[PDB]
Ligand binder design. Structure first.
Ligand SMILES: Oc1ccc(F)cc1O
Ligand SMILES: Oc1ccc(F)cc1O
Ligand SMILES: Oc1ccc(F)cc1O
Ligand SMILES: Oc1ccc(F)cc1O
Ligand SMILES: Oc1ccc(F)cc1O
Ligand SMILES: Oc1ccc(F)cc1O
Ligand SMILES: Oc1ccc(F)cc1O
Ligand SMILES: Oc1ccc(F)cc1O
Ligand SMILES: Oc1ccc(F)cc1O
Ligand SMILES: Oc1ccc(F)cc1O
Ligand SMILES: Oc1ccc(F)cc1O
Ligand SMILES: Oc1ccc(F)cc1O
Ligand SMILES: Oc1ccc(F)cc1O
Ligand SMILES: Oc1ccc(F)cc1O
Ligand SMILES: Oc1ccc(F)cc1O
Ligand SMILES: Oc1ccc(F)cc1O
Ligand SMILES: Oc1ccc(F)cc1O
Ligand SMILES: Oc1ccc(F)cc1O
Ligand SMILES: [Cl-]
Ligand SMILES: [Cl-]
Ligand SMILES: [Fe+3]
Ligand SMILES: [Fe+3]
Ligand SMILES: [Fe+3]
Ligand SMILES: [Fe+3]
Ligand code: NA
Ligand code: NA
Lengths: 238, 200, 238, 200, 236, 200, 200
């Protein structure tokens, strides 16, 4: 079983979005009004699931083939790849990276999506993989379209892919969103702007990566992810 | 001062979180292996329990699109981190509220006692992370058990909550669901009876 | 019939792309080696077709509906709109604007397109309209995907829509390409860079136009087009 | 100096130009009304002629994806600018090279004489704009007729070409296609026999 | 028979003042705590009153003569003029512009005004007019004085005139305030500063307009007003 | 992106709004023609109704200096934009709360049904804009009628309000005032029972 | 976009390239072991062949200071990367043109068929890199064989050359030199009959 053998650098909650960001209307009623209670790290917080033994399907990381109903999805073919490191720069190997997204027209394959834009019969929109021994992951997909939502009267999410990353402990687990280099919708989005520091937003913007493209086939985008720094305990209890 | 690389900032899981992490609930086909809400095979050691709850916003309305991740010790107080659908027990699971009733369920065993870093026993607990549309960074909480009152009163984590009335927000209520032992743990994100959320 | 009643400002052929731009490989053998012969404007050059009496179909300007085989095309729904003016700022009314493009995945509906990305059974990729009495045009379409081509070993066109504009004379007729605000492929493209002056390239970049979007429906991009300045003759022959 | 708004810069029509401007040639369905290569209804006034040609690159190879726009006076020397598929004659048309043979065709009438701006008669001519993959800005040329030698020798536009040998590149060769009067006008973009291209 | 034939550009609610601006104390309890609910435009929102045949009196736009009790008001004689356009730069002709203000000493003719400064027996403080066919309006008035008010313990409104503009629909209707070029009270005012963006505040500052003054008579200030962009529907 | 001219920003109407827009309530003489709270002369077609209401702040206290503007269809579901004090009916009016009691009144007819832009019928409604001291930009709402339950249930505007409980805030209560049909419509700016406000 | 470290830029090998890479041709003593033009010892499996050629500039004159590097599969279609002067066969060698005659020679075996990355067979070929004074970055080409017409016709590399006439530039001519099978492969850097050069 798991042991308490490390500590995780405290989160900067002014770098992360705060809970109450009223331009993102749903956050008003879904944000606490009391302060978070700080607690020291124990084995409950410094351990978490490792997914090395989860059974992955052959195409789990390939959204071009994992919802195959007779053909290829329509859309901009792309590899999304990168490295998961911690704040000390150390690779995070064998960690679960999950992603989900809309199709090329900004339609989600989800019963609650009321957007008119059509489903793609060959696109599901979910992927998962494990980082390799050097911290690298990769997915193949189509670039999601922007899509309109009921926040303000004319609000549109930039093209984005939802990411979840487990990391070494429940303390490191993160859900975030990847955006795309140069998208003019990014600075207009109240969800992006839940993050108060524009330098923090920069960290969510995937860069075009021509070096990783397959010629005559697919483009590529690089998205590196930084989880909380992990260090050994020192001078504790003594 | 020394500045490390900045952590990638959080964003909301959004309304369609189920596409990626709760495929059936999205209305979609599932893959061969899914991470879900049955932590214990029927013959796993310990006392088998059902956990269930609803999640409320600051207006008293159900949050019908919430997603929860849980992490708990097994009955012997050990964290089983090698996740595997063939394990008798996984310390990790996931659940989500149904859209109709807004209710999540988890099938597990009551966790055993584990010590904090100073060697002091913590009361039996389940670590919970709550995600949803409108929640920009996930909320951490703990589910403790109302039939562990002696343990709860001495828990060095519960004791960090300054007000006793707020401690009460973390104590699940023993009940019976279809005749079986269960504990209900409702979460109030905001307002009257607001659930304690942790930073660590 | 047509009369010679105007003159058109001489083209700046260092603002336009030159003919020989060898990074665009096909231009090497398809560019003249002799100088162009300058000639004065006559009625042959200062007149041209007016298309007011061409019969337009109801959906000719709407690529979401003009190739309807049972459903809507998959892709980012967009209005592309703007104004056609001359270099003096005067609107160019009742002029033919034609456009053609690939689908959301960068596949063209053309027998010679060897790209693997699938056709969309509900997308053709051509539109036409006439500017209105104030010089404005508009189309509805899906945003085309980038697509790979055999120039260099890893060359990709940015997302683009081909435009042809007639204007008042054969002297004004122009074919050009619209690109999209923020696309990181734009500065890497040898066809874009056939234009030597980056300020000229800026004129081909359509801007996101939220004011013209239909909420919960489609985004919009603005692309204004400037044709050669038209002036009356003065002090000629005398 | 005075600077106006800059003209929108040209770009190549590209290989798939036919999608937008030559739908049939792309392999696609056509719309009710298309702008194409038959300028004259059979009973239009004047001498009915076929024009045809091939287009060559600097290596002597056919440019099989070229697109041409033409503008010419009617038989009475009048430019008919009100384009309409019901007209007896349109001064405007479009044609494109076939991919197999690389040959374009146009059905028209021989144009009448029009004067230049100084009142001097120009020889009968067709104004041509040539577009293609690899051509960044379209090339302007004129097609004149080899059975108008007297007129051609006095044309104030042909006379602006300094070298007589280059004037020859603009003169279409009278011939017969399926027994009917035709003129062949090949274009050489580059190199030996390079066709004169104009700026105006 | 008003008709739905246009759409109005969505408001930027970070350009406008937000509802909760606590330094403006009365906004604390008079601001919603739930988000506004966005709805699409219908004929209900895209139409509104046209006041072309409201009956205006001779002096309705002239505060120097519309409260005449035997003399002229005391104070700085001024013309307040400008153009009403939409965000596309289109003039907004035949639209209703209403204005109200205090007198030269900062005293309002209103029963609830407890400020000690005297009323002016020949000044009322209200005007109204229609923009002309090119979108222009004009009033003649006296420059209002600044006003102390019970917000913080030494708060003073800059000199200001309240404006109401109808525009083409209920969606365009606006109430705002005009301030005067150079007034050092402007950056100190918590009502002005309800607007977060100082470039938006700049849009409320009327500029001295010597070109529109009547020599030996009255000065003039220019205040242009921009209402929401109006466009036709497309692809609906 | 494309950026237009910025809209002139809003400011509070302030406590003395009545000077400009409600002359009698300020304690002042009125002009020959005023825009006020009688939308229907007695002879206008439709069911004649009195409307009344109070406005509450976040502490439950009356907002005694509220100013309301209203816009509604006539009985046949047509908006009448040509404002004229001679008309039997005008679609527009203004009212204000009295300083002692805090109550506003309107005299009108029940509006007929009007379709939204997609052709779907909206329940009978009056559009309201609320202005006051402490309100920086006016608040938009709608007044619907409790005796139109079937229509309210199917209104595509009401159905954009996610919680049913919030829809109830827009339904005015039928009563009788001096033998005449009336509806009370109270507005709560903030807190418990907070009235739905719209952006469009 | 993502930008890596820039590659060290190329420069011409220059006229004295032989000092470094072709010691005997410089007029210099050689070292014990040199990399040179005999890829196959007499006993290596496969059809033993002599290859020879001349290199022409744009004016049709011999490039007498050319240096060529070659890379080819053995007779069984396998690339042998472990370079060793003991091997019966090496996949790599070097040659140079003589200063008087301008001719280079190679002694090798005809390479077997190798598949491209998609599994399609390529015709037998030798990969050539050409270096010289006045060549700023080396030129890549392939030498194919005129007695493999059927395979050449179906080669997926040859088929990437748009014009058939240009494909002919890569086909070496079978002949006999002193009773032994030879192939001549001339390279024309520029102009008429210009050899196809590749980027990859
Ligand atoms: O926790 C809070 C955070 C921000 C705020 F405005 C109020 C709160 O109670
Ligand atoms: O280390 C600690 C951190 C937070 C806290 F509340 C108590 C601790 O002992
Ligand atoms: O079962 C699934 C597999 C792949 C995908 F993209 C979506 C699914 O629902
Ligand atoms: O918080 C922000 C983040 C990114 C941005 F472009 C603007 C913001 O106000
Ligand atoms: O597994 C770990 C344990 C302690 C530490 F500092 C880093 C690790 O990656
Ligand atoms: O110490 C406590 C622990 C749990 C609880 F519900 C109340 C307490 O005061
Ligand atoms: O016309 C030309 C243009 C550029 C060049 F390098 C050579 C030419 O003959
Ligand atoms: O006006 C002219 C322009 C170009 C030219 F070659 C001759 C002309 O007379
Ligand atoms: O006939 C057509 C009509 C519309 C289109 F997009 C393509 C076509 O080939
Ligand atoms: O000619 C150019 C045009 C645009 C650009 F970004 C780079 C260039 O070299
Ligand atoms: O038709 C025209 C004629 C002369 C001119 F200067 C401008 C025109 O638009
Ligand atoms: O003047 C001329 C006109 C046409 C031609 F072919 C040759 C000439 O010298
Ligand atoms: O409820 C709220 C709380 C804070 C805020 F800025 C706006 C709100 O609507
Ligand atoms: O359908 C809609 C719903 C809400 C909104 F704000 C705009 C819409 O177009
Ligand atoms: O009736 C009035 C007329 C003009 C004025 F300034 C104030 C009034 O109350
Ligand atoms: O919000 C403001 C507006 C104008 C100003 F001068 C300062 C501010 O803080
Ligand atoms: O749909 C509704 C409409 C009005 C109301 F009061 C409650 C509802 O649930
Ligand atoms: O396909 C070919 C291959 C080699 C050659 F010489 C000519 C060809 O047409
Ligand atoms: Cl279950
Ligand atoms: Cl034909
Ligand atoms: Fe999303
Ligand atoms: Fe293209
Ligand atoms: Fe005031
Ligand atoms: Fe050297
Ligand atoms: Na916010
Ligand atoms: Na170039």
């Amino acid at each position: 079983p798991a042991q308490d053998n490390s500590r995780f650098v405290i989160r900067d909650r002014n770098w992360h979005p705060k809970a109450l960001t009223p331009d993102y209307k749903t956050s008003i009623a879904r944000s606490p009004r009391q302060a978070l209670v700080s607690i020291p790290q124990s084995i409950s917080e410094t351990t978490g699931p490792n997914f090395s033994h989860l059974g992955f399907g052959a195409h789990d990381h390939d959204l071009l083939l994992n919802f195959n109903n007779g053909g290829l999805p329509i859309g901009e073919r792309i590899i999304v790849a990168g490295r998961v490191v911690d704040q000390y720069g150390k690779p995070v190997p064998n960690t679960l990276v999950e992603m989900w997204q809309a199709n090329a027209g900004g339609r989600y394959r989800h019963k609650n999506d009321r957007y008119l834009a059509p489903l793609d019969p060959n696109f599901g929109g979910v992927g998962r993989c494990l980082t390799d021994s050097d911290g690298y992951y990769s997915f193949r997909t189509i670039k999601p379209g922007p899509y309109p939502w009921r926040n303000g009267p004319n609000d549109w999410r930039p093209a984005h892919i939802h990411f979840g990353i487990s990391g070494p402990s429940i303390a490191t687990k993160l859900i975030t969103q990847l955006y795309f280099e140069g998208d003019p919708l990014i600075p207009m989005c109240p969800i992006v702007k839940s993050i108060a520091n524009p330098e923090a937003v920069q960290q969510l913007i995937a860069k075009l990566d021509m070096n990783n493209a397959n010629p005559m086939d697919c483009l590529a985008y690089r998205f590196d992810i930084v989880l909380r720094g992990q260090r050994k305990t020192h001078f504790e209890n003594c | 001062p020394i500045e490390l690389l900045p952590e990638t900032p959080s964003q909301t899981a959004g309304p369609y979180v189920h596409i990626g992490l709760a495929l059936e609930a999205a209305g979609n086909p599932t893959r061969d292996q899914e991470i879900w809400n049955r932590l214990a095979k029927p013959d796993a050691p310990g006392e088998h329990i059902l956990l269930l709850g609803q999640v409320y916003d600051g207006n008293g309305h159900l949050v019908r699109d919430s997603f929860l991740e849980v992490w708990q010790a097994d009955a012997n107080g050990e964290y089983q981190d090698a996740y595997n659908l063939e394990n008798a027990f996984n310390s990790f699971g996931r659940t989500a509220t149904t859209f109709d009733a807004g209710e999540w369920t988890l099938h597990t065993v009551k966790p055993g006692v584990v010590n904090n870093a100073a060697g002091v026993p913590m009361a039996p607990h389940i670590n919970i992370s709550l995600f949803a549309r409108g929640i920009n960074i996930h909320l951490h909480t703990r589910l403790y058990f109302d039939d562990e009152a002696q343990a709860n009163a001495k828990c060095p984590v519960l004791n960090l909550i300054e007000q006793p009335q707020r401690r009460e927000t973390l104590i699940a209520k023993r009940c019976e669901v279809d005749g079986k032992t269960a504990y209900r743990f409702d979460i109030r994100i905001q307002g009257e009876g607001e659930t304690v959320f942790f930073d660590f």
